[PDB]
Write a protein that binds this ligand. Structure first.
Ligand SMILES: CC(=O)Nc1ccc(-c2csc(N)n2)cc1
Length: 191
């Protein structure tokens, strides 16, 4: 989580696409969906990012449809957005026990239980939180099995980005769950 506002500059693809889906939360505008292999994925927009501006004009109070409308009508050689980094999320850093556990239980990507003497307990991991990222990778829509494997494949040190379930649910509506398994960029970032 970067604790300020950053700017990004977007360029429509061949198709006139930026690969981005926004959602009106609490009179902000927030990233509901980022498509793999898209300008938005390239410029490093993330699930749960706030869009403060688009081309200088402020996003306050705007409807999802409006924000989409604005992105369309704009001349696409250069779109400048102003982004607060995943405001609704935090990141927790755990260390696997020599059994390879960080030490929690989760179902549908929502952490349901924390285990005693676990790194997850020590680090103050919370339940009723939806897992958004692991080591930088968006894992939203992935089946619990696949998330489970990501945590398995990761090193000793694990990093989880989490989002209070009440908020996660509010964000990921107007979308099916295994649509998100498809559409949502789940790639490690390019460099
Ligand atoms: C700029 C723009 O119009 N973005 C946009 C609009 C709608 C959707 C969408 C709704 S349900 C689903 N599976 N995908 C995604 C992205």
């Amino acid at each position: 989580i970067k604790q300020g506002i950053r700017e990004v500059i977007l360029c429509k693809d061949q198709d006139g696409k930026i690969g981005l889906r926004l959602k009106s939360i609490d009179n902000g505008i927030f990233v509901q969906l980022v498509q793999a292999n898209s300008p938005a994925s390239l410029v490093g927009l993330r699930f749960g990012d706030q869009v403060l501006q688009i081309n200088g004009e402020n996003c306050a109070g705007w409807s999802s449809d409006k924000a989409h409308k604005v992105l369309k009508q704009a001349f696409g050689e250069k779109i400048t957005m102003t982004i607060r980094d995943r405001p609704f999320e935090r990141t927790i850093t755990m260390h696997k026990d020599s059994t390879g556990h960080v030490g929690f239980i989760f179902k549908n990507g929502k952490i349901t239980s924390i285990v005693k003497d676990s790194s997850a307990a020590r680090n103050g991991l919370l339940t009723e939180h939806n897992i958004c990222e692991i080591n930088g990778q968006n894992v939203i829509g992935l089946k619990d099995s696949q998330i489970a494997d990501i945590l398995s494949t990761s090193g000793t040190v694990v990093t989880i980005t989490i989002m209070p379930a009440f908020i996660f649910e509010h964000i990921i509506k107007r979308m099916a769950p295994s649509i998100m398994k498809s559409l949502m960029d789940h790639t490690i970032p390019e460099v």
